[PDB]
Amino acid sequence: EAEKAADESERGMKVIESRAQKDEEKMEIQEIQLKEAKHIAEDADRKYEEVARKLVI
Amino acid sequence: EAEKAADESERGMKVIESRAQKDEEKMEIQEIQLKEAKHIAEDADRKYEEVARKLVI
Amino acid sequence: TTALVCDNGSGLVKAGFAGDDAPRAVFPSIVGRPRHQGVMVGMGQKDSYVGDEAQSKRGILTLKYPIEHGIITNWDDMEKIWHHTFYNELRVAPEEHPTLLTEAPLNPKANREKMTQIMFETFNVPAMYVAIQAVLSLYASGRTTGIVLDSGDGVTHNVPIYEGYALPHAIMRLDLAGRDLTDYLMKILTERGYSFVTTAEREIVRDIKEKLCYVALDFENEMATAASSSSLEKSYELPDGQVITIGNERFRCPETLFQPSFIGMESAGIHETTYNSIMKCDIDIRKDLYANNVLSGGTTMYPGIADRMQKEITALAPSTMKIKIIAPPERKYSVWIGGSILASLSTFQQMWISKQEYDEAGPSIVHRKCF
Amino acid sequence: TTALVCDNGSGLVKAGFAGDDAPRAVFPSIVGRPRHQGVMVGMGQKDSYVGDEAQSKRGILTLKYPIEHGIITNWDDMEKIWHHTFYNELRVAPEEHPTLLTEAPLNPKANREKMTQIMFETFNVPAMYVAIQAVLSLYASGRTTGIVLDSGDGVTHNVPIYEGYALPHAIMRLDLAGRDLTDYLMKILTERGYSFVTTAEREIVRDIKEKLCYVALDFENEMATAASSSSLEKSYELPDGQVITIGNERFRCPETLFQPSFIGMESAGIHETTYNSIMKCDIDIRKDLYANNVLSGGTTMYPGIADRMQKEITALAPSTMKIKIIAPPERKYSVWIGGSILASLSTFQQMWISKQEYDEAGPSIVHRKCF
Amino acid sequence: TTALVCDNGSGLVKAGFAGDDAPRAVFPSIVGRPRHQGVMVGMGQKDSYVGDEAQSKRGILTLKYPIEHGIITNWDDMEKIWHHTFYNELRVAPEEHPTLLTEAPLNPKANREKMTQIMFETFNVPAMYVAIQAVLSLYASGRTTGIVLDSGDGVTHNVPIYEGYALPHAIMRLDLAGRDLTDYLMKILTERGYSFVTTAEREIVRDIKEKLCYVALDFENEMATAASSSSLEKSYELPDGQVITIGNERFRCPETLFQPSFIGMESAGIHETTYNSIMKCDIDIRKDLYANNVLSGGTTMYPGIADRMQKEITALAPSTMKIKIIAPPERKYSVWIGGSILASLSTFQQMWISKQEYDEAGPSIVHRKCF
Numbered sequence A, B: 001e002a003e004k005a006a007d008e009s010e011r012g013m014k015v016i017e018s019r020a021q022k023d024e025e026k027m028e029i030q031e032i033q034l035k036e037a038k039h040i041a042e043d044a045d046r047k048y049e050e051v052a053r054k055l056v057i
Numbered sequence C, D, E: 001t002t003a004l005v006c007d008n009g010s011g012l013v014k015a016g017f018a019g020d021d022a023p024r025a026v027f028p029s030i031v032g033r034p035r036h037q038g039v040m041v042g043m044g045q046k047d048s049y050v051g052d053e054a055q056s057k058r059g060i061l062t063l064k065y066p067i068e069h070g071i072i073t074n075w076d077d078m079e080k081i082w083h084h085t086f087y088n089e090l091r092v093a094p095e096e097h098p099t100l101l102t103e104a105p106l107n108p109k110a111n112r113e114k115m116t117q118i119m120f121e122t123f124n125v126p127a128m129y130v131a132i133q134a135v136l137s138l139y140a141s142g143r144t145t146g147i148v149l150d151s152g153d154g155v156t157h158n159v160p161i162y163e164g165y166a167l168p169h170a171i172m173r174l175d176l177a178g179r180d181l182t183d184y185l186m187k188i189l190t191e192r193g194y195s196f197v198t199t200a201e202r203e204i205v206r207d208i209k210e211k212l213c214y215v216a217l218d219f220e221n222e223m224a225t226a227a228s229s230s231s232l233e234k235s236y237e238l239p240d241g242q243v244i245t246i247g248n249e250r251f252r253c254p255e256t257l258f259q260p261s262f263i264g265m266e267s268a269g270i271h272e273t274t275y276n277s278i279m280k281c282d283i284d285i286r287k288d289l290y291a292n293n294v295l296s297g298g299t300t301m302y303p304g305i306a307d308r309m310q311k312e313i314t315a316l317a318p319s320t321m322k323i324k325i326i327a328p329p330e331r332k333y334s335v336w337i338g339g340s341i342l343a344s345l346s347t348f349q350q351m352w353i354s355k356q357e358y359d360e361a362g363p364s365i366v367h368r369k370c371f
């Protein structure tokens, strides 16, 4: 049973590390799209601030 | 040796599951902020078009 | 040959060869000294970090500006700044390159004399010249009349010029500038619970001031809006996290220009000084001076400053006078552009101060009619 | 000639020549005396067993540690330890070998003074130098910044270094260490039925701690699991039989590091002292200290300590920072590796305290710039 | 009716009725919690000890100061402290007595608003008011002109007043105070072998600082004398025994006030901040401010501080200007004396914040003209 548990541990660590690298790629791409989303949000924010100042003046 | 190997494999799978839940709430918060950023940017687009027409007139 | 156009200013040294469209090297003018002892041996730390390098080591250095208000108070630091500018940012030997220098109006003669002496003795430049920071800005705007407001980080001044003839008796100088605005922001951010004391985090406060501060068209209305609603609040991310939100303080910092009494100064606001300088001149050129207001300097880059200043000066000025304010996007670098244009002129080649002339006449040659 | 690097440490003396990749001699710092009478005539037992020899005769000796927490308390035992290390372990004459010594921060000056006096007088070493454990640990870790947590058997401390510059006001020292963990393991083993009192059984308890204990990522969840499941129980073979099985006591002993309230200490856990030390430093270097957390010392060798401390710091720190913990496999010998690297540097050769300087300025020369 | 004058301070709450020569209730502002189990049943133990009661049980409790640097960081503890002051030390119902409170300059607005809200809601006082401590110190001194230095236990600040007019732009606030001095004394006492870590030992270190520490006229000369001779060694007797001996750290601890570099702070000493504040004012009032330097606060009773500060200022100030330092013996309670005097004026009776005014205007009434 020690050897059986060792084999269980080996394919378990294989599958969890595969899922882990998948998760790393996923978190990286969503962090990137977080950067673009924040950039677009702030862009729209100050663009509308400027146009509203122009409207009031 | 096999018992020790199974031990650190169990620790690794537990910690990677914990990181999986961590990434889960990370995905939740990034999704909700992405949705709110999209909504505010699109509303900014409509109000920008409206105030641009107002500026022209 | 080519001419170098160095613009020391205060808090930002910008330089480049004459004839270029834009300055080549722009970096803050600070000198850093390590305030700790250092435990790791063999690294061999230098005893002074100068220029843009000191910005990356803010956490282990103390930053001292060698220029307080236009004038130079620490000459060794200024010499280090000049050496760094000539030998690292531009990587050109000043032995065979004339230099054009700028400084604010109404400055001590000793400052100019010592600058000239250091530049002929230490660096041995073939020739050099000193120009007013406002006339160059007037060149860069493609104008020949009108007044120019050069609000930098050290000093703010107005120089009325009509048809290329300056009016010395109408020049007004004010010591309120960007540094005082940064200090006032540091002081008023304490009421929200944020404490900034170290000279390193003064740069952080300057970053907030640049990024978020704006000038309000009306003060009382914006105060009421901020007190009632909360739509004017924005959040800034500090270098170590703990995002902070600033509300009413967003537009109170730049209002010191129009309300100098906030920092205790008795002098009048920017618009009032501009109007007083306008009416200090003659009566036959007031219309052209009204119609050709020119803005320059970094401090004049706040969003909405042009509209507020125009409204104030229109309120002061008679109704039947057209008022226009010229605010090009490149206000910050306008002075250097004008300096490059002036140095590229062919007729200016005879106005340089030759080294032989300096040796024959002494350091007092610059103040002489050979300006 | 070649330099000699000796690390007195606490509970383990490790030494070797400079330029080596690993210490040659590692043995416990124990002096034992026979407590019985002795009836056989002719063998002639010696009156003091020193070093690893006392481990063999552990059952008939009273093992005394010459140092309690960094500070030497029994000087004569320390001359015995140093003589054994220099003669029976390295088999070298210290008359022609400069000696580098390692010493913990925030310790009495009399300690360093007596150490240097003993080295210069008793052993007549030509030159010597005393260094801080954290700096050596950072040397061996291939880093120039980052906060290092050195937790040995005597004392646990954090020293933040940025760009080779230390922050003395941010150094935090905690006296909780491996010896207190062993004592708590004794105190917690007696609730199951095993009593260890004699100083000989101190070594057995320490061996059990080294071989079986581990840090739990969550405390309440692990206790709940162990209250029902019996999968956490492991057996240990005493040097005479009667195997013992320990359940939740295996992961409760190292929890004292993160829960110092178990042994009555008022202070906070190491995960909190590290965060407090980081927030003590300047605001412009907190990100680099967060991203370069370095571990060293024997006590930081528990399985799963890195994950637990990373989780705790991530909970404490703002959510916008990446918390990274560096745990090289050779944590225990990191300080000696750093010492070998430091002594092998060529520019270090002029920083030794030579015999002439010690003779001229007395023992007080240690606290000069040759810190 | 009579008014109450409660001075929160930082670590020392002093209160009493208005119109008295001195407060009748002085006790440290600490809240203690039992950190042990407690075996005896029926003892009726309390879960929180406040005020001077916790000073008698330091060895079984943990001491938490509700105020870090002027700002209250724990409102439940402050509520308990105020309830204790009103109901046990003073033994008067606050429902029929106006209350006067004090706070430091440049205090966050939320702190003052929450203070007034708590006072109006929980204790239901009929009227209340908050005043700056420097103004009260000036009133107690019998002067009406002169820069005042109020170095307490949490914060040190200077406020210049000329002819009853305050200059907000010249107020300098520094976070160095008695607590930092106590921490530095803890840090430097380890140089001899005495370790004080638990919050209980903080009071012992504070008592040592109060009894023995003094300010040296010169630093280098006194250090040389201490290193050469042994006349400065003074012994203190701990609550048990093992009398400790203190050498040059007897006067090295208060030097942090004049050398903030010891604890790693960037700002200059108090002797230099005072001069900077003096030069921050106008030019026609600098003579009176030089000649009317006022000292207050508990931290300003180190023997010889007045002479050292006078020497420093005379070194900084022009030669033809005379410098005078006022150090009344009742320095610690000067703020309360001024508060009682101010509350005794009949003119001040119209400046109270009535409960109806607060109810109709909300918490924002405090920052209105009723400052």
Ligand SMILES: Nc1ncnc2c1ncn2[C@@H]1O[C@H](COP(=O)(O)OP(=O)(O)O)[C@@H](O)[C@H]1O
Pocket (backbone or CB within 6 Å): C008, C009, C010, C011, C012, C013, C151, C152, C153, C154, C155, C178, C179, C206, C209, C210, C211, C213, C297, C298, C299, C301, C302, C332
């Ligand atoms: N857009 C902006 N918003 C706020 N402050 C600004 C902006 N641009 C420049 N500044 C301020 O102007 C200062 C630099 O002005 P500058 O014209 O470089 O002075 P000098 O010419 O004397 O160096 C900086 O301290 C900066 O804080």
Ligand SMILES: Nc1ncnc2c1ncn2[C@@H]1O[C@H](COP(=O)(O)OP(=O)(O)O)[C@@H](O)[C@H]1O
Pocket (backbone or CB within 6 Å): D008, D009, D010, D011, D012, D013, D151, D152, D153, D154, D155, D178, D179, D206, D209, D210, D211, D297, D298, D299, D301, D302, D303, D332
């Ligand atoms: N694998 C391990 N797991 C847990 N604890 C260990 C391990 N190895 C060593 N230790 C502990 O570390 C201590 C040795 O620390 P050491 O590095 O010698 O400190 P110092 O450098 O101050 O002498 C021992 O007392 C032992 O209890």
Ligand SMILES: Nc1ncnc2c1ncn2[C@@H]1O[C@H](COP(=O)(O)OP(=O)(O)O)[C@@H](O)[C@H]1O
Pocket (backbone or CB within 6 Å): E008, E009, E010, E011, E012, E013, E151, E152, E153, E154, E178, E179, E206, E209, E210, E211, E213, E297, E298, E299, E300, E301, E302, E332
């Ligand atoms: N003779 C003295 N020597 C050293 N420190 C003193 C002395 N007298 C008072 N202090 C310090 O002053 C502090 C109390 O000052 P105080 O005016 O009560 O400030 P606060 O009102 O903020 O508590 C104490 O913490 C104490 O350490």
Ligand SMILES: [Mg+2]
Pocket (backbone or CB within 6 Å): C009, C010, C133, C152, C153, C297, C335
């Ligand atoms: Mg400029």
Ligand SMILES: [Mg+2]
Pocket (backbone or CB within 6 Å): D009, D010, D133, D150, D151, D152, D153, D297, D335
């Ligand atoms: Mg060690």
Ligand SMILES: [Mg+2]
Pocket (backbone or CB within 6 Å): E009, E010, E133, E152, E153, E297, E335
């Ligand atoms: Mg006080």
